[PDB]
Scaffold this motif. Structure first.
Motif, PDB file in Angstrom:
ATOM      1  N   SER A 133     -17.514  -3.825  -5.056  1.00  0.00           N
ATOM      2  CA  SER A 133     -17.561  -5.076  -4.741  1.00  0.00           C
ATOM      3  C   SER A 133     -16.068  -5.467  -5.057  1.00  0.00           C
ATOM      4  CB  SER A 133     -18.284  -5.969  -5.498  1.00  0.00           C
ATOM      5  OG  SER A 133     -18.385  -5.835  -6.748  1.00  0.00           O
ATOM      6  N   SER A 134     -15.488  -5.160  -5.980  1.00  0.00           N
ATOM      7  CA  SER A 134     -14.118  -5.172  -6.290  1.00  0.00           C
ATOM      8  C   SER A 134     -13.326  -3.900  -6.946  1.00  0.00           C
ATOM      9  CB  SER A 134     -13.650  -6.217  -6.986  1.00  0.00           C
ATOM     10  OG  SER A 134     -14.378  -6.140  -8.343  1.00  0.00           O
ATOM     11  N   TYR A 135     -11.912  -3.872  -6.713  1.00  0.00           N
ATOM     12  CA  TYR A 135     -10.972  -3.025  -6.923  1.00  0.00           C
ATOM     13  C   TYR A 135      -9.869  -3.764  -7.723  1.00  0.00           C
ATOM     14  CZ  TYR A 135     -14.030   0.490  -4.579  1.00  0.00           C
ATOM     15  OH  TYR A 135     -14.832   1.108  -3.988  1.00  0.00           O
ATOM     16  N   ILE A 136      -9.340  -3.213  -9.061  1.00  0.00           N
ATOM     17  CA  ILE A 136      -8.024  -3.764  -9.686  1.00  0.00           C
ATOM     18  C   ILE A 136      -6.824  -3.081  -8.833  1.00  0.00           C
ATOM     19  CG2 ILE A 136      -6.841  -3.830 -11.890  1.00  0.00           C
ATOM     20  CD1 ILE A 136      -9.340  -5.703 -11.664  1.00  0.00           C
ATOM     21  N   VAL A 137      -5.813  -4.041  -8.473  1.00  0.00           N
ATOM     22  CA  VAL A 137      -4.710  -3.648  -8.035  1.00  0.00           C
ATOM     23  C   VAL A 137      -3.630  -3.170  -9.070  1.00  0.00           C
ATOM     24  CG1 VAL A 137      -2.763  -4.260  -6.480  1.00  0.00           C
ATOM     25  CG2 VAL A 137      -5.031  -5.267  -5.584  1.00  0.00           C
ATOM     26  N   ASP A 138      -3.274  -2.059  -9.050  1.00  0.00           N
ATOM     27  CA  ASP A 138      -2.511  -1.466 -10.179  1.00  0.00           C
ATOM     28  C   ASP A 138      -0.908  -1.728  -9.982  1.00  0.00           C
ATOM     29  OD1 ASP A 138      -4.859   1.387 -10.162  1.00  0.00           O
ATOM     30  OD2 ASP A 138      -4.912  -0.270 -11.416  1.00  0.00           O
ATOM     31  N   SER A 139      -0.550  -1.567  -8.568  1.00  0.00           N
ATOM     32  CA  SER A 139       0.904  -1.508  -8.334  1.00  0.00           C
ATOM     33  C   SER A 139       0.867  -1.866  -6.728  1.00  0.00           C
ATOM     34  CB  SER A 139       1.641  -0.201  -8.314  1.00  0.00           C
ATOM     35  OG  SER A 139       1.201   0.625  -7.638  1.00  0.00           O
ATOM     36  N   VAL A 140       2.335  -2.437  -6.506  1.00  0.00           N
ATOM     37  CA  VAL A 140       2.505  -3.178  -5.339  1.00  0.00           C
ATOM     38  C   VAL A 140       3.851  -2.498  -4.618  1.00  0.00           C
ATOM     39  CG1 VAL A 140       3.587  -5.279  -4.639  1.00  0.00           C
ATOM     40  CG2 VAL A 140       1.057  -5.343  -5.212  1.00  0.00           C
ATOM     41  N   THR A 141       3.741  -2.396  -3.348  1.00  0.00           N
ATOM     42  CA  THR A 141       5.288  -1.969  -2.655  1.00  0.00           C
ATOM     43  C   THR A 141       5.447  -2.791  -1.557  1.00  0.00           C
ATOM     44  OG1 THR A 141       4.261   0.082  -1.113  1.00  0.00           O
ATOM     45  CG2 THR A 141       5.103   0.455  -3.374  1.00  0.00           C
ATOM     46  N   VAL A 142       6.466  -3.318  -0.938  1.00  0.00           N
ATOM     47  CA  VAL A 142       6.820  -4.255   0.283  1.00  0.00           C
ATOM     48  C   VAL A 142       7.917  -3.487   1.018  1.00  0.00           C
ATOM     49  CG1 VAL A 142       6.447  -6.270  -0.987  1.00  0.00           C
ATOM     50  CG2 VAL A 142       8.798  -5.404  -0.874  1.00  0.00           C
ATOM     51  N   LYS A 143       7.558  -3.515   2.455  1.00  0.00           N
ATOM     52  CA  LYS A 143       8.404  -2.841   3.574  1.00  0.00           C
ATOM     53  C   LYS A 143       7.953  -3.607   5.024  1.00  0.00           C
ATOM     54  CE  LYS A 143      10.169   1.389   5.343  1.00  0.00           C
ATOM     55  NZ  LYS A 143      10.216   1.213   6.855  1.00  0.00           N
ATOM     56  N   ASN A 144       8.947  -4.020   5.928  1.00  0.00           N
ATOM     57  CA  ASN A 144       8.964  -4.663   7.099  1.00  0.00           C
ATOM     58  C   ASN A 144       7.828  -5.589   7.164  1.00  0.00           C
ATOM     59  OD1 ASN A 144      10.547  -2.247   7.829  1.00  0.00           O
ATOM     60  ND2 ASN A 144       8.789  -0.941   8.369  1.00  0.00           N
ATOM     61  N   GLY A 145       7.866  -6.602   6.481  1.00  0.00           N
ATOM     62  CA  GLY A 145       7.172  -8.025   6.638  1.00  0.00           C
ATOM     63  C   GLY A 145       5.775  -7.646   5.845  1.00  0.00           C
ATOM     64  N   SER A 146       5.214  -6.361   5.358  1.00  0.00           N
ATOM     65  CA  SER A 146       4.191  -6.074   5.044  1.00  0.00           C
ATOM     66  C   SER A 146       4.180  -5.569   3.521  1.00  0.00           C
ATOM     67  CB  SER A 146       3.394  -5.012   5.812  1.00  0.00           C
ATOM     68  OG  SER A 146       3.372  -5.324   7.041  1.00  0.00           O
ATOM     69  N   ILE A 147       2.872  -5.694   2.993  1.00  0.00           N
ATOM     70  CA  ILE A 147       2.588  -5.509   1.459  1.00  0.00           C
ATOM     71  C   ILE A 147       1.609  -4.477   1.534  1.00  0.00           C
ATOM     72  CG2 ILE A 147       1.109  -7.372   0.770  1.00  0.00           C
ATOM     73  CD1 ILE A 147       2.274  -7.349  -2.019  1.00  0.00           C
ATOM     74  N   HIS A 148       1.813  -3.308   0.725  1.00  0.00           N
ATOM     75  CA  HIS A 148       0.780  -2.512   0.063  1.00  0.00           C
ATOM     76  C   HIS A 148       0.238  -2.580  -1.358  1.00  0.00           C
ATOM     77  CE1 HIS A 148       2.293   0.703   3.385  1.00  0.00           C
ATOM     78  NE2 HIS A 148       1.961  -0.293   3.878  1.00  0.00           N
ATOM     79  N   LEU A 149      -1.145  -2.812  -1.434  1.00  0.00           N
ATOM     80  CA  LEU A 149      -1.688  -3.109  -2.801  1.00  0.00           C
ATOM     81  C   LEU A 149      -2.586  -1.615  -3.064  1.00  0.00           C
ATOM     82  CD1 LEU A 149      -3.438  -6.671  -1.844  1.00  0.00           C
ATOM     83  CD2 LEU A 149      -1.039  -6.199  -2.918  1.00  0.00           C
ATOM     84  N   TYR A 150      -2.069  -1.036  -4.289  1.00  0.00           N
ATOM     85  CA  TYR A 150      -2.538   0.182  -4.526  1.00  0.00           C
ATOM     86  C   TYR A 150      -3.713   0.288  -5.773  1.00  0.00           C
ATOM     87  CZ  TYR A 150       1.497   1.853  -1.996  1.00  0.00           C
ATOM     88  OH  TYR A 150       2.108   2.175  -0.595  1.00  0.00           O
ATOM     89  N   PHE A 151      -4.924   0.698  -5.569  1.00  0.00           N
ATOM     90  CA  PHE A 151      -5.940   1.098  -6.480  1.00  0.00           C
ATOM     91  C   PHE A 151      -6.316   2.180  -6.270  1.00  0.00           C
ATOM     92  CE2 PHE A 151      -9.230   0.781  -2.986  1.00  0.00           C
ATOM     93  CZ  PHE A 151      -8.665   0.250  -1.909  1.00  0.00           C
ATOM     94  N   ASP A 152      -7.290   2.556  -7.445  1.00  0.00           N
ATOM     95  CA  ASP A 152      -7.999   3.823  -7.340  1.00  0.00           C
ATOM     96  C   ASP A 152      -9.438   3.724  -6.976  1.00  0.00           C
ATOM     97  OD1 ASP A 152      -7.732   6.719  -8.524  1.00  0.00           O
ATOM     98  OD2 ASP A 152      -9.429   5.921 -10.028  1.00  0.00           O
ATOM     99  N   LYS A 153      -9.680   4.410  -5.948  1.00  0.00           N
ATOM    100  CA  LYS A 153     -11.053   4.495  -5.535  1.00  0.00           C
ATOM    101  C   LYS A 153     -11.726   5.807  -5.914  1.00  0.00           C
ATOM    102  CE  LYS A 153     -14.035   3.233  -1.570  1.00  0.00           C
ATOM    103  NZ  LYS A 153     -14.228   2.544  -0.464  1.00  0.00           N
TER     104      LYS A 153
END
Length: 281
Positions: free
Chosen positions: A5-25
């Motif tokens: 139902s949810s996942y914790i975001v551990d880290s973040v990276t930005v590039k070309n007006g977009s963001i990536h939210l990293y999590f462990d699944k």
């Protein structure tokens, strides 16, 4: 291990007006991509909200406060069911130094320029001057819609048909970047999968469909003929947020390309497709 139902975001990276939210699944490093625009004002992503809906499947909380994290985890049990997807729980500390209005607007504009250049097959050297003006104006705090519109009107000569309106290219670009939707200059079809039934549409959605002459296509007839669903940006936007999302996810379920077009010309009905009409007649 199913999609909780949810996942914790551990880290973040930005590039070309977009963001990536990293999590462990389930022990595998994963990410979800979102446009940077949703991260300028984080209040829209807080669990308390003010409407009771999230623009993206993300909940921003304060990792320094125990209650804010637990509350957000509890709230994501509801939103996960509402959105039919897990929620990424993001500490506000990870998105501290992201941008600053114009800073994010310049990153947005650069992404708009790349989609405009590849959609209308325009060489980047021809845009060099118009991109420099546009970027120096965004730094002067001139509205993104103004800078984009000024850019399209100037850059459009010889690449965009005279029949298509600048405002429709502008909306195509903006939307293209927000939901990662392919853009084309080709004739629309306003075809919709049979999965999205008339019985479940609101009067505004059914009427909007009838107004733009939206037609129903069977998933298998569309798959075997490799049919792409091509909607006119204005016609698509006359539809509800829920209906727009449903049409796209149904196309993705059946591996059918979904595109937005700035064109008003209709492609010839060469496939068995039934026009969307009122349930009675």
């Amino acid at each position: 291990p199913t999609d909780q139902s949810s996942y914790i975001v551990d880290s973040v990276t930005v590039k070309n007006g977009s963001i990536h939210l990293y999590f462990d699944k389930a022990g595998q490093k994963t990410y979800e991509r979102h446009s940077l625009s949703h991260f300028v004002n984080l209040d829209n992503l807080r669990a308390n909200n003010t409407k009771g809906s999230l623009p993206i499947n993300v909940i921003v909380f304060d990792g320094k406060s125990k209650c804010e994290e637990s509350s957000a985890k509890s709230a994501s049990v509801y939103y996960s069911q509402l959105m039919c997807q897990p929620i990424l729980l993001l500490d506000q500390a990870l998105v501290s130094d992201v941008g600053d209005s114009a800073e994010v607007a310049v990153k947005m504009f650069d992404a708009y320029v790349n989609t405009f250049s590849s959609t209308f097959n325009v060489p980047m050297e021809k845009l060099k001057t118009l991109v420099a003006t546009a970027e120096a104006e965004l730094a002067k705090n001139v509205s993104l819609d103004n800078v984009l519109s000024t850019f399209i009107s100037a850059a459009r000569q010889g690449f965009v048909d005279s029949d298509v309106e600048t405002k429709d290219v502008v909306e195509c670009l903006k939307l293209s970047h927000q939901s990662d939707i392919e853009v084309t200059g080709d004739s629309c079809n306003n075809y919709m999968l049979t999965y999205n039934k008339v019985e479940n549409m609101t009067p505004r959605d059914l009427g909007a469909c009838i107004d733009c002459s939206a037609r129903h296509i069977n998933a298998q007839v569309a798959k075997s003929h490799n049919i792409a669903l091509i909607w006119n940006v204005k016609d698509f936007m006359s539809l509800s947020e829920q209906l727009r999302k449903q049409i796209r996810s149904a196309a993705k379920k059946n591996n059918l390309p979904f595109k937005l077009t700035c064109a008003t010309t209709r492609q010839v009905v060469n496939v068995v497709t039934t026009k969307i009409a009122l349930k009675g007649g």
